[PDB]
Every structure is written in structure tokens, then in C-alpha cells.
């Protein structure tokens, strides 16, 4: 038993001066920190830092560095005093083969540069034809942000042509405004964008523009519906793709010789060489497969065996582990066979947002991954020949990746810089030295130094109730969870406080994670609520068996799990979690769930919270809803996951139910909230709307985030205290 | 003193059963009526009246009529029992002149057809270049729902030309879907369609289609902006015009002779001739001219001397008066003189809405005119030659006309059918009766009979408390001023009820009427709410005097009126009235004021509910806007009467607005939703939100009306159960 504690109500004014506050508090828990991070050998005894970061005083963005002192870094072979690094200061590439060579996408067209004058360019007809830009649906969903490809070797570029025609149109704006430009935008069961792949050939200055002939992915992929990956093999001879089906349950590997371009005829056992366009791998899920980074050609041994080799991803029951994949052809070009040679152990995943660096004169791939637990990743490497492998960050502590398709700064021979965090700690950059040993493959690491920018105030140093990181099992599946929970400022073990269960729940994201990302919540805590965050099945790097279970049951499973979850904390937590004071808060998928919960489990959830919900699948893009609803589109399916199948089972009582969505969400569309109002207005269901005119998925504006923040908490106050 | 009552609270799903059955119980409250009344003389012993209803048994409309037993009413001359007249069953006009001759408009082109063939249509080449459909700021503000007329003499055709290419584009529809075609919508400050008038010409099958010369309106009217009405003149020979300003301020009528068309050139005191076409009349005020249906040309009675006399509105400090206004020419065509004979006391005011009829064979014009209260409609007869005035309707019972443009279903010789209502009472369709006397002018009636439609139910015997219509004088202005209220189902003297102000406040619009339209409002009445009507200054049908106090002031005047009306009522009511319990509800220019009360008196009303609010008169259109509030367009007189500059003094509590707009509303724009809501949000303000993405500017769909309904009757008692 415990004792119910005060829950202390306040005025709205209140609560916008709380969210206010908060804002200038919060960023006072940050420093500056740069935005990329990258190292160099200008010379062969000196290695250089370099990172952006603002100019202090400013906002202005400049790009900084520091010499990193290798003579005495090599001596911090042990844990001593780390040594400082001061930075100081002072959709485009330069071709690795020529430094006068510079390529670039402008305006949406792929323009080439020799010393500051334009030589080349691309043009189109349409505003709806475009080239050097991912497809929107690749960007945003198959997540590959680059059209731009140039081989190390040589003169000559790779691009990707992008045909929009037709794509259905989306229209944005406010009505009784005048019309804008219309949004070309997939839905699930309607037609994408059409892709093929070109080249730039630049011979002496005279460039040469040069499509793939159209059937070359096609014949070998019957299937294909996307180029989910590009570029250059080695020596810039052949150029490869990975492409996928429609549900993207295929996926296929193909590596493209120059021959199988329409050139101009001015420029044109018993095991074979690259006779042609031939799948090197090919990969069949029963659900789905998804994309990453892991993706690297290695130079051939052997010219007169010139053995198809690279680093790829293998998806598994358990875990996405990096291979080595090998193929050898026929005399005629075909494959005869694929080796599939595991470089890691199936339990853990790679981070498939990260890129990879491998090493030729070693045979070492460095790469991220799950080693040392499921919320946390770690910097690895591994000897591909040998499988051998090695841990190079310490456990407990985790990699912090700053963008999407991600790189290590890593310098081979003498280590890496990279930020790392934890749950207890700020995101920090940090440089490992390597060090190498007489008859080893693998190096270790040692932490030798931090690096800050110049000109900047130093750390905070911060004081709060770090989060409970708790794992459990599932009492029904024997699965293993994760889950988090936030302490409520002035804390009470024998009183219970009130509960704010924040989901999300999707899949692709993973919300339980050994980060300092928790900080925003922070402002809830100092309201007197506890925070908990539950991960479930179809969250994030886990393995394809624990993400499956939501295919063609969104809204069925990971409900359930949010649901048991949280029970289960309440026992382990001793009791001071009030099961009838409940919350549920989410937005995009979690605005979804937090729908599904409270339709679904009306005497556990008071109130929800869903602000940018999705209510029908079939009004969300092609490239998410089908990979996980299944194509052809099935109306019973889809059906069944829809929230206009729940809107029936929505609360009958006021103040139960808030819906909060931007009117210029791209993202989710407005149009899934007008769906979902108009059935509760049919089924005579109350709702409270909050929309932000001149917003878009989240809510940026600094005021209008703080109006945000308030309501949602007023509305929880008034949700509980009853 | 008085005691509080006890108000009764209830849930949202019982507010939702109460609104459902409700509206079905509303519709038991009146019978299947008819939607046009008019007779004829089918021969010269016979009347027969004919109107439009629904077939017994379905929503099927069709021709029913009756004849009338002349004889029979000829005899009923005293206060008699009344006779039953049962009506049975069994875009486009028939040229008078020509009874196989029809022209009509088809997909916005006027088409003329002969015996089922069409001869002769207009084309273009455009959308938005429209033939015979009146200007869409025409037909909605200045109230032209016709572009087709017929010569009664001859087969001659006048039509509307419009050019809606430089109108500004609306958008409406959902976001993320589909664009759909732009709405033409001129706004404030903004350019208008442009119109011009066109012919054509019948000869003997032979169709001419010809323009107006382009100067002959312009040339005489400098101020040229809109054409508010247009006919033929008298035996089809000449065209006449109303013609206004941009600000209305400035209206003039002019008559244009055959000879001003351009024409093929096959076809084309000393007081004179219509030489060329000239100003027959023109008018000026220092605030507005509103438009009117009470234009009417007279027969010439000489021909040597074709004296310009025609039946028209003049605008008087107080009322708006008919007058025989007449003119004369120079020899050479323009006007040395004009009249302006008043048939009429500047009193009261002429219905503006409602067209008149007018005999030549004794110089009588009927028409409807505020003759026994600023109230009520009576049909009241003049002779234009004399002034001589009489009211042929009793006082306290009102006219009712089922339609703008409306026209009396008048027989010169026998009298009139009409639908005629009163506070107390249903409107009811009867027939009155002429009586003549030797050596007398005006004529006299008798209620001889009522008419109903066969095959339906007759009238429902209603039972409730008669609205109190109440009259009183401001304290402030010594103006006249008229409100009403409806007592709470089960009243007791010496107790005290929440109020439930409703208002609207614009000009154009009369709420405090003596007709049965009150008894929507039956169902705020049994849940124990007071609801009060107030009219004020600003307010239809009082004169300019009254009207011209919101010149450029919209919003500063108007709401101080209803403020005092309140008070004065709940003196006036014995102290039956709560003013610590005050909610105030409105729609469209209500729910203007309805922010701009709770904004400006927070110590008054408790809350608003505010539906269909106009924001921002920037984003509103043109004819509207600019007549009250001017023109060029000043932002500080726009800024002052915007809502933008009271979103500061709107109530930091939450439960005190309440926003209630629809998404599809092409009379008041969603756009001036996001601009309120929006600020709310800057300025920190809390409001509750609904929306109706299927719905315009009203709330139409049974079950969207019913949910309306529940929640603006869930947010009152909890507004002011405090």
C-alpha cells in the first residue's frame, strides 16, 4: 500500500511560465558542439581535426580545427589525465581523382565545375523531373540522401534521374488563400516515382551524358521497384545498385560494367568475370528487409579471379550482422554462387543508419553496432578474412550518431574522434588512440583526449535523479523489454504519483536508449509526474523476428506490450506508480497508439494525448505502410489497423481524448486528422483539437512550443485530478 | 433579490440525446409548406392559384394548385369563417412577348431555344468568363440572383457579361489530398470581376448577339465599380441600369436606348427625348447606399412627352421611403431636372428584399414596408400620383417572404396570397380579398381563406411560453431598440437563470422580429437558460441614420448596445436574470462579437462561443467590406476593428472561448480561423476548438448539427457552473 501523494494543480499562465522557463533552463544543460566531425593526414606525422561549429558570439557556421598532438597522445597508454583539444576556427563534392573537379546538385540538377566554370549541367523539362536528388520516397523512407556519386580513380560521375509525373498530388496551404505549388506524394497503393541511374563522362573537358539502358536492372530484377543504394565498385570501372521490391520483402545486389550504359558508339572450376550486369547478392525476406549503409565494395585480389567481394548486411531472426559477401560467375557471366560469411555473432545488430570504413591493407571493417546491450551502440571491428572480432568502445557507454547515413571519423593507423553518451552524461566528443601489437590483427583503443570548441563556455555541471534503466521480461511472449523511468523531482518511495506513459512505438525508432535525450522530460518531472517510456515488438534494432510481429497488425501487438509494460513497472517499482491516474502521450506513430490504448484500454488510460496521429494507413506514403500492411492492398487489413474501426470505442466523457496536429504537416497529413474528427463527430464522441496554422510535423517555433507544452500539461492535470 | 435557481448539469452523451431528439421533435412543430406563391387569371372568371411542394409521401417537388371560389370570397366582406382552399398536384423563362420562345442558363451560358431546338448560345473560352450568372460578389452582396431578362413586347434578350480573370484564387479542401479548382474570391483592397451587358436579337430566327459600347455606362458614371440592377424599359424599346460606386457610397440610375449597342452596322420648358443614353437619376450619401429590388419603369403616358417616371428607393436619415422619381431632358438628352416625389413617411422602411408590383390601368404600387413596427412586414398599397397611402395587412401580424428577390402573389383586381406569421404563431399561407368603392383610390381587404397543400398533415396544436417581445430606449443614445426573450421551459418569477445572450450585431440582418423563427431556440429554453435577442445600432430596416453609426467603427458601437440591452432587460425582468452566469453565442459577424464582448466585458460574460468568426476584415470580400468600412483601405481602420488587437484581452482562464468554424467555408474563410488561432498562440491564450471538415459556413448534416449542439451546450454550463 502506499500513500496517494498531493498532485499540485496550477493556471494555465502557470504552465506557460513553466514551459517558458524550462526552455531557457534546458538549453543551459548543452553546450555548443559541432555538427560533423571528421580527421585528416595533411602530412605523415600529423593528424588534423576538423569539425563545423558555430562562431561564438553568433549563430554564423564556420568550419574549425585542431592539430591533434600524436607524439603525445601515443603515450596515454593508460588511464591518466586526458589531455584538452581546443577547436579554433579557420550537397556538394570534389572528385578524389581531381581536386580541379567539383560536382554539385542546384536547384535540383546536376551541375559539373572545372576551377569555378560550369562545363556541364543537367536540365528538365518539369519541376517534376529532377536529377542528383533521391526520390522523395527514398529520402524520407529507404533514408538515402545523395544523387551524387564520383569514382575514386577517375573522370567520371554517377547520378540519379527521378520521374514524379505521376505521383499524386498533395495540397498544402490554408483555405481561402491563394494555391501554391501541390506536393507530389505516394500513397499506400498508388504509383510511384520512376528511377534510372546516368553518368557524366568528363574526357579532357568534354563531357559526355550517358543513361543506363532501361532494362538492365529490370531483367535481372522482375521485381524492382526502388533503387534503395548506389555507387561506384572499385577503380571506378563498374557501377553497382541495390535495389528492392515493392514491400520491399526482395531485395537484390547488382553489380552494372560500363557496357550496359547506352554509350555512343564513339565510346563503344570454369569461373568468369564481370561479362555483364549480373545480381551479386540476392536476399528474400518473409516480411521484410531494411536498408542501411553496410554497403562496400573491396578491391579484387586477383585480376585474373577478380572475386566478387564487399561488406554487406545479412537480416536475421536475431540481429542485422555485417558479412562478407562473395559471389562467383559462370564463363557467361551468371552466378553460380554466394558464400554469405558472417563477420559477427547473430545476437546483436549493426547500426543501419551508420556508414562503415574498411581498410584495405588490413582487412578491417570498423562499424557500429549492439555488442555490449540492445540500448547502447558501440564502435567495432572486425577482420573480414577471419571473422575475428574486437570491441573498441568501453560498455555502458554509447555512440551518439549526429545525422542519418552517418561516418566514423576515423584516421586507420591512428584512431577515431566521435561523440559519445550516456544516460547519467552529455553527448561528449572524445578521441581513441590505437595501438598496435607485434603478431595481432585487431587494435586496441585507449581514451586519450576530449575535444572542445574554442571561444565557447565550458560543461555545465548538472544535478538531477538519473533514469531508472530497467530491463523485464514479457510475462506472455518471454521476450525482453526495456524500458525507462523519469523520477519525479521531489521524490516519495512510499507515496504514488501520477503517470505520463509516452509512446511511440513504431517501428524504425527506438525510444529506450543509453542517451542524454531523456533531458526534455525533465519539465514533466518537475510537475510531479513520473515518465516512463516502454519499448515492444516491432521497435527498433532487435532482429527481424522481434520486429515482425506487427505485419499487417499495426495497432494489434504493440499496444499490448505497452500495456503489460507498464503493469509490470508499477510491481517492480514498489507500488508508487497510481494505476488510476494514467496518461498516454505520443505523436506520429505514438499519436496512433496513444488512439489505440485508450479505444482499446479505457480502465487503465485516462486520458490520451495523440498529436500528429495517423488514423488511416491508406492516406500515409507507399514505401512505410505497404513494407509493413503487405501490397497488394487489402482493404480488410488495413481496415482493421485504421483508428475509424475505434473511434466507437473513444471515451464517451470530456477531457478524455486531445488531439494536437500541425495544419502544414507534410508528413501526416492534415487530412488524417479530418478523418478522424469527422467520425467522432458521426459517433457523437468528444475531443479537444489543438492546431498550429504555420506549423509542420513538430512544433518549432519557440512560443508556439511553449503553448504546446502547456496545454498538453493543463489537460493532463485536469485529466487525473478527478 | 431573487434566489439562484438550480442549474442542472448533465453529460456530454445526454447534451447529444437531447439535440437528436430534439430536432426530431422541432420538425413536428410546423407542416409541409410551399416555395412560391403566385396566381393568374387562367381566364376572366377564374383565379388560380399554383405553388411548389413536395409530392405526399416523399422529398419529390412538383406544380399543385387550386381555383380559387371567386364568387364565394367576393361574398366573405366581414370577419366570417373562413374557407380551406386544398392545393393538388398536376433558371428558365418564357419570353412574354412569345410563347415559344425560351432562353435559360446552362453550365453558366445563356442559351435561347424555339419549340425544344436551341437557336442561338453564348460561348467562352473560360471558366471564368460567364454569361447570364450574376458576378459572384453580385449575387452575394448585392442580392442579383437573375442575368436573363425578356422584353415584355418583343423578342429581344438582355444578359450579364462577367470577367472573373484577375479575381483572386481561394483554395479550399484537405490538406494532403488532391487539389481541386480555385474558388474566385475578391477581397478587401482587392480587384473585382468585371461586367459589361449584352444582347441579343430575334428576328425571325435570326439571333444577333451584341455588345454594350463599352463607354456608355463609364461616361456617365465615373465612380463605375458594379452593376446592381438591370431590365427593359417599358414596351422593350431601352435598357436601364443601377450602377454604384466601389464603396456604395455613390449609385445612379441611367436609361440606354437601342442606339448605344454597338451594333451590326445593318441595325445601327424645351424639354426633349432618351436622345442617348443619360442619368435619370443619381444619389449620394456620406456613409452607404444600400441596394434594393424596388426599381419599377412606367408606362410613358405621352409620347410627344415620355416623361422618365418610374417607381424607386430613396434613402432617408430614417427609413427607406418609395418615390415616384421622374426627370426631364434637354433637347439634347441630358437631365436639366429631377423630382424625387415621396410616396411615403420617412418613418419606416420599405422591405429592400422583396420586389413590388405596380398597376397602370389605377396608378396603385404594392409592396411591403415596416408600416405598423420596425418589426413586422405589412403589405401596404400607395397610389403614385397622389401620395395616398394604405395598409392592407393587419398590424401585429408580418409578412413573410420565403426568398430574396421575393415577389407578392398579387392580382390587381381580386388580391393577394401570401404567407403571413407572427411571434405567437406559425406562418400561415391566406388569401385577402379586395374591396372596391365608387369614388375611392386605395382598395380594401378581407381575410376571406387559407390555403394548404393536400395530402399532408394539417397543423400541430403548440404549446410554450410566447416569447416576451420587449421595447425599450437606450440610456446612452435615446435611440429606440428591440429585444426579445425566451423564458426557460419551467419558469418561476422569483428565481434567477444562467443567460444565454445571443447575437449577430451586423448590418443587413434583423434578429428581434415578429415571426416563429424563434423556435430553434426552444431547445436552450429546456435546459433552464434565458435566451436574449438584442438588435442594435448598425441593425436592418431602421434607416442610414441607424445603420451609419458602424461606419468605419465595426465593433466599437455594436457591442456596447447589446451590452446595455442586457442590462436593461434584467431590470426590466424583475431580476429573473443571473449576471454572474453570462455566456454570449453568435455566428459569422456573431462570433465576431461575440470575441469582441468577452474581450472587452470579461467582468460581463463568463465566455463566448464564437462560430464562423471574421478575424480579420482584410480577408473578407469586397462588396461587403468596403461599404462599411471604406475605401482605398486604411490599416489603421481596418487594424481597429480587427480581432487581432483584442486577442490580448481575450480571457487568460481556460472554458471561456470556445471557436467553432468549418472547413469548407467559402463565405467565411478558415483562413480567419488560423490568423485567431494563431495569435492565441503567440499571446498564450487558452481556447477550445471545433471543426467541421465537411461542412461550410453553416452546420447542415443532421448528426454534425446534433453534435454541435451538444458541445455548445456541454461548454455553457460548465462556463458558468462556477
Chains 1, 2 share one sequence.
Not at 593528424?47 to 591533434?68: C, D, K, R
Not at 563534392?93 to 546538385?105: E, G, H, I, R, T
Amino acid at each position: 500500500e502506499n500513500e496517494p501523494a498531493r498532485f499540485e494543480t496550477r493556471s494555465f499562465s502557470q504552465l506557460i511560465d513553466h514551459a517558458r522557463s524550462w526552455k531557457t533552463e534546458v538549453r543551459g544543460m548543452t553546450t555548443q558542439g559541432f555538427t560533423k566531425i571528421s580527421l585528416m593526414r595533411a602530412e605523415k606525422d600529423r593528424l588534423n581535426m576538423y569539425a563545423i561549429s558555430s562562431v561564438p558570439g553568433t549563430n554564423t557556421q564556420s568550419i574549425f580545427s585542431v592539430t591533434i598532438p600524436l607524439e603525445l597522445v601515443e603515450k596515454a597508454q593508460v588511464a591518466d589525465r586526458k589531455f584538452e583539444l581546443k577547436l579554433k576556427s579557420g550537397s556538394a563534392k570534389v572528385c578524389p581523382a581531381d581536386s580541379s573537379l567539383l560536382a554539385y546538385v542546384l536547384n535540383k540538377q546536376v551541375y559539373i565545375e572545372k576551377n569555378g566554370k560550369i562545363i556541364h549541367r543537367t536540365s528538365s523539362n518539369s519541376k517534376h523531373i529532377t536529377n542528383g536528388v533521391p526520390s522523395y520516397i527514398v529520402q524520407e523512407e529507404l533514408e538515402r540522401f545523395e544523387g551524387i556519386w564520383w569514382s575514386e580513380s577517375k573522370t567520371r560521375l554517377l547520378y540519379e534521374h527521378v520521374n514524379e509525373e505521376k505521383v499524386a498530388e498533395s495540397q498544402f496551404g490554408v483555405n481561402g488563400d491563394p494555391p501554391v505549388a501541390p506536393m507530389k506524394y505516394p500513397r499506400a497503393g498508388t504509383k510511384n516515382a520512376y528511377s534510372t541511374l546516368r553518368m557524366v563522362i568528363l574526357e579532357n573537358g568534354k563531357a559526355y551524358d550517358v543513361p543506363l539502358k532501361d532494362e538492365v536492372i529490370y531483367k535481372h530484377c522482375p521485381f524492382y521497384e526502388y533503387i534503395t543504394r548506389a555507387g561506384f565498385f572499385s577503380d571506378g570501372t563498374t557501377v553497382w545498385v541495390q535495389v528492392m521490391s515493392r514491400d520491399q520483402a526482395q531485395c537484390s545486389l547488382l553489380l552494372i560494367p560500363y557496357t550496359d550504359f547506352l554509350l555512343p558508339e564513339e565510346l563503344g572450376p570454369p569461373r568468369g568475370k564481370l561479362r555483364g550486369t549480373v545480381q551479386i547478392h540476392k536476399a528474400r525476406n518473409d516480411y521484410w528487409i531494411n536498408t542501411h549503409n553496410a554497403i562496400y565494395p573491396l578491391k579484387i585480389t586477383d585480376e585474373e579471379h577478380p572475386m566478387y567481394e564487399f561488406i554487406y548486411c545479412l537480416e536475421k531472426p536475431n540481429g542485422s550482422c555485417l558479412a562478407l559477401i562473395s559471389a562467383e560467375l559462370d564463363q557467361n557471366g551468371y552466378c553460380r554462387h554466394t558464400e554469405e560469411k558472417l563477420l559477427m555473432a547473430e545476437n546483436f545488430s549493426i547500426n543501419k543508419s551508420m556508414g562503415i570504413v574498411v581498410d584495405e591493407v588490413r582487412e578491417l571493417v570498423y562499424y557500429v553496432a549492439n555488442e555490449s546491450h540492445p540500448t547502447e551502440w558501440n564502435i567495432c571491428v572486425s577482420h573480414y578474412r577471419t571473422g575475428q572480432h574486437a570491441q573498441l568502445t568501453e560498455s555502458g557507454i554509447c555512440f551518439k550518431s549526429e545525422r542519418a547515413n552517418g561516418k566514423l571519423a576515423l584516421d586507420l593507423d591512428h584512431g577515431f574522434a566521435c561523440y559519445m553518451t550516456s544516460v547519467g552524461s552529455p553527448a561528449e566528443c572524445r578521441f581513441y588512440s590505437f595501438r598496435w601489437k607485434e603478431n595481432e590483427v585487431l587494435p586496441s583503443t585507449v581514451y586519450a583526449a576530449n575535444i572542445t570548441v574554442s571561444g565557447h563556455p565550458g560543461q555545465p555541471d548538472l544535478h538531477f535523479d538519473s533514469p531508472e534503466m530497467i530491463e523485464f521480461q514479457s510475462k506472455k511472449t518471454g521476450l525482453m523489454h526495456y524500458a525507462m523511468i523519469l523520477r519525479p523531482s521531489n521524490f516519495d518511495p512510499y507515496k504514488k504519483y501520477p503517470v505520463f506513459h509516452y509512446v511511440y512505438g513504431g517501428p524504425g525508432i527506438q525510444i529506450v536508449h543509453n542517451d542524454f535525450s531523456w533531458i526534455q522530460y525533465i519539465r514533466f518531472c518537475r510537475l510531479g509526474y513520473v515518465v516512463v517510456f516502454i519499448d515492444n515488438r516491432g521497435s527498433a534494432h532487435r532482429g527481424i523476428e522481434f520486429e515482425r510481429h506487427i505485419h499487417k497488425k499495426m495497432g494489434t501487438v504493440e499496444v499490448e506490450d505497452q500495456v503489460e509494460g507498464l503493469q509490470m513497472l508499477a510491481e517492480r517499482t514498489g507500488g508508487f506508480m497510481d494505476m488510476s491516474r494514467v496518461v498516454v502521450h505520443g505523436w506520429s506513430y505514438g499519436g496512433y497508439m496513444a488512439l489505440q490504448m485508450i479505444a482499446k484500454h479505457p480502465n487503465i488510460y485516462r486520458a490520451a494525448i495523440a498529436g500528429g496521429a495517423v488514423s488511416d494507413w491508406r492516406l500515409y506514403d507507399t514505401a512505410y505502410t505497404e513494407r509493413y500492411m503487405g501490397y497488394p492492398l487489402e482493404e480488410h487489413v488495413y481496415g482493421a489497423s485504421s483508428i475509424t474501426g475505434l473511434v466507437e470505442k473513444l471515451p464517451d466523457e470530456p477531457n478524455r481524448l486531445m488531439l494536437v496536429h500541425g495544419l502544414m504537416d507534410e508528413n501526416v497529413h492534415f487530412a488524417h486528422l479530418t478523418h478522424l474528427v469527422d467520425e467522432c463527430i458521426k459517433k457523437g464522441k468528444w475531443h479537444e483539437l489543438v492546431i498550429f496554422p504555420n506549423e509542420r510535423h513538430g512544433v518549432r517555433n519557440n512560443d508556439a512550443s511553449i503553448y504546446l507544452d502547456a496545454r498538453m500539461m493543463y489537460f493532463a492535470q485536469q485529466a487525473i485530478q478527478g
